[PDB]
């Protein structure tokens, strides 16, 4: 088969300036007749791919007219003359030379901003969900930049680990920010052994770790 | 409105079937190859199989040992994939497509997948169906609320907020899947603080695999 490689893995680049995503494929997609066959789509978070550039550098209908395709043989380029905030996603190169079909590995445009220290929320467990026996203790991380954060919990000052999991969402599309939630999940009885439930929060924006914490549950 | 409309995903049991179809509209069906992709949970695009317009020609991925059999019905203009033996690493959102170009001949594939569907996720796995518990995340400046949605399977489950009138701010996290065999996830919005206990506030959480729609109300403490 035809093996397709991307370059780079993840770019980020800031609104404003230009995107070059490589895609080097290991048999020569030029045909006699002058053309590559070679393809770019753009996945968005949660959606079906989308054609971006046919033919190797045809822009399809309807797609923005700051992309371009370029290349020839077995070197291509998806070049983003003005990278914008909603170009945040996974971008893949396709061959349509030969079956069967075969994409590139994928490359993942993150769009850098100006740091932006996470808005930290704790929320207790419902008494709806202690009726049911367990209990569980989530902690917001809200709209921060750049992605790494740290969360540390504490039950009466005790350091949690191995018992917290963590979910973060993808780049928001339009403020190109993340959240992040870690959820402490214990049974009633557990929960009820402790009073002081503490989230410690670290964050390039911080100039210090922020903490949020409860009583009750005892 | 070229429109291309996956249905047929669903849970499925190792080593049972399932058929997939594809609903299209919007243009001439019977003048197109038709292309079925799938994207398996955090990897990329795999090719799966295209049939040509009248359905002479079907060809498959080999890696798929002939478990899969792609047809055609242009009459209904609609596109199947049936796909037999199933086995775990079939799990995947699978979407059709259509294709501008035909082959150009001598085993050359179909060109420019111009419109794709929205997909259709089939989970291979032994599990039951199970519905999810809906719990508030009770909360001037800004305050932060939202549900919490647990222990159910399998994905996905779809999460609004005022019956979809409440989207700023809001974030729904990636589901985690649990010791227990179950996802559970979070769905947080911030509003502002002036508005708790004046504006009321629900999410509506809808698991398709249950049937199951839950609607929460979340109230300050
Ligand atoms: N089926
Ligand atoms: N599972």
């Known amino acids: 088969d035809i093996v397709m490689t991307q370059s780079p893995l993840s770019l980020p680049v800031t609104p404003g300036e230009p995107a070059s995503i490589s895609c080097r494929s290991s048999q020569s997609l030029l045909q006699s007749n002058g053309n590559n066959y070679l393809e770019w789509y753009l996945q968005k978070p949660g959606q079906s791919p989308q054609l971006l550039i046919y033919?190797?550098?045809n822009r399809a209908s309807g797609v923005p007219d700051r992309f371009s395709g370029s290349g020839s043989g077995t070197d291509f380029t998806l070049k983003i003359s003005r990278v914008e905030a909603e170009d945040a996603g996974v971008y893949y190169c396709?061959?349509?030379?030969?079956?069967?079909?075969?994409f590139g590995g994928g490359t993942k445009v993150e769009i850098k901003r100006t740091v932006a220290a996470p808005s930290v929320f704790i929320f207790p467990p419902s008494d709806e969900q202690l009726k049911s026996g367990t209990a569980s203790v989530v902690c917001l991380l809200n709209n921060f930049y750049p992605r790494e954060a740290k969360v540390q919990w504490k039950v009466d000052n005790a350091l949690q680990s191995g018992n917290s999991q963590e979910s973060v969402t993808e780049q928001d599309s339009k403020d190109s920010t993340y959240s992040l939630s870690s959820t402490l999940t214990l049974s009633k009885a557990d929960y009820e052994k402790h009073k002081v439930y503490a989230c410690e929060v670290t964050h390039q924006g911080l100039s210090s770790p922020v903490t949020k914490s409860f009583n009750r549950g005892e | 409105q070229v429109q291309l409309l996956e249905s047929g995903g669903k849970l499925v049991k190792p080593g049972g079937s399932l058929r997939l179809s594809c609903a299209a509209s919007?243009?001439?069906?019977?003048?197109?190859?038709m292309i079925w992709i799938r994207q398996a949970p955090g990897k990329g695009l795999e090719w799966i199989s295209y049939?040509?317009?009248?359905?002479?020609?079907?060809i498959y991925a080999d890696s798929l040992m002939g478990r899969f059999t792609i047809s055609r019905d242009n009459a209904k203009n609609s596109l199947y994939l049936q796909m037999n033996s199933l086995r775990t690493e079939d799990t995947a959102v699978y979407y059709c497509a259509r294709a501008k170009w035909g082959t150009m001949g001598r085993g050359a594939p179909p060109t420019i997948y111009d419109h794709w569907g929205q997909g259709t996720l089939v989970t291979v796995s032994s599990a039951s169906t199970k519905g999810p518990s809906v719990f508030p995340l009770a909360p001037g400046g800004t305050a932060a609320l939202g549900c919490l949605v647990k222990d159910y399977f399998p994905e996905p489950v779809t999460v609004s907020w005022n019956s979809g009138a409440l989207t700023s701010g809001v974030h729904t996290f990636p589901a985690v899947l649990q010791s227990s065999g179950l996802y559970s996830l979070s769905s947080v919005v911030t509003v502002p603080s002036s508005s708790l206990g004046t504006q009321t506030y629900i999410c509506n959480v809808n698991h398709k695999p249950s049937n199951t729609k839950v609607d929460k109300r979340v109230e300050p403490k």
């Open positions: 049939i040509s317009s009248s359905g002479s020609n079907t």
């Open positions: 396709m061959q349509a030379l030969q079956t069967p079909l075969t």
């Open positions: 919007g243009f001439t069906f019977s003048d197109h190859y």
């Open positions: 033919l190797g550098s």
